[PDB]
Amino acid sequence: CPEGYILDDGFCTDIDE
Protein backbone atom coordinates (compact mmCIF):
# COMPACT_ATOMS: atom_id res chain seq x y z
CA CYS A 1 0.00 0.00 0.00
CA PRO A 2 1.16 3.54 -0.80
CA GLU A 3 1.93 6.18 1.80
CA GLY A 4 -1.23 7.25 3.57
CA TYR A 5 -2.86 3.88 3.03
CA ILE A 6 -2.87 0.69 5.07
CA LEU A 7 -4.32 -2.79 4.79
CA ASP A 8 -7.40 -3.34 6.93
CA ASP A 9 -10.00 -5.57 5.32
CA GLY A 10 -7.60 -7.08 2.81
CA PHE A 11 -7.66 -3.75 1.00
CA CYS A 12 -5.64 -0.56 0.95
CA THR A 13 -7.76 1.88 2.92
CA ASP A 14 -7.13 5.61 3.10
CA ILE A 15 -6.08 6.69 6.57
CA ASP A 16 -4.41 9.99 5.75
CA GLU A 17 -5.19 11.97 8.88
UniProtKB/Swiss-Prot annotation:
Show the disulfide pairing: C1-C12
Tell me the superkingdom of the source: Eukaryota
**Post-translational note:** N-glycosylated. The iron and 2-oxoglutarate dependent 3-hydroxylation of aspartate and asparagine is (R) stereospecific within EGF domains.
Q: Where in the cell is it found?
A: Membrane
**Subunit description:** Interacts with ITGAL, ITGAM and ITGB2. Interacts with thrombin/F2; this interaction switches the specificity of thrombin from a procoagulant to an anticoagulant and antifibrinolytic protease. Interacts with ANGP1 and ANGP2; these interactions significantly inhibit the generation of activated PC and TAFIa/CPB2 by the thrombin/thrombomodulin complex. Interacts with PF4; this interaction enhances generation of activated protein C. Interacts with HMGB1; this interaction inhibits HMGB1 inflammatory activity.
**Function comment:** Endothelial cell receptor that plays a critical role in regulating several physiological processes including hemostasis, coagulation, fibrinolysis, inflammation, and angiogenesis. Acts as a cofactor for thrombin activation of protein C/PROC on the surface of vascular endothelial cells leading to initiation of the activated protein C anticoagulant pathway. Also accelerates the activation of the plasma carboxypeptidase B2/CPB2, which catalyzes removal of C-terminal basic amino acids from its substrates including kinins or anaphylatoxins leading to fibrinolysis inhibition.
What is the protein named?
Thrombomodulin
What organism is recorded for this protein?
A: Homo sapiens (Human)
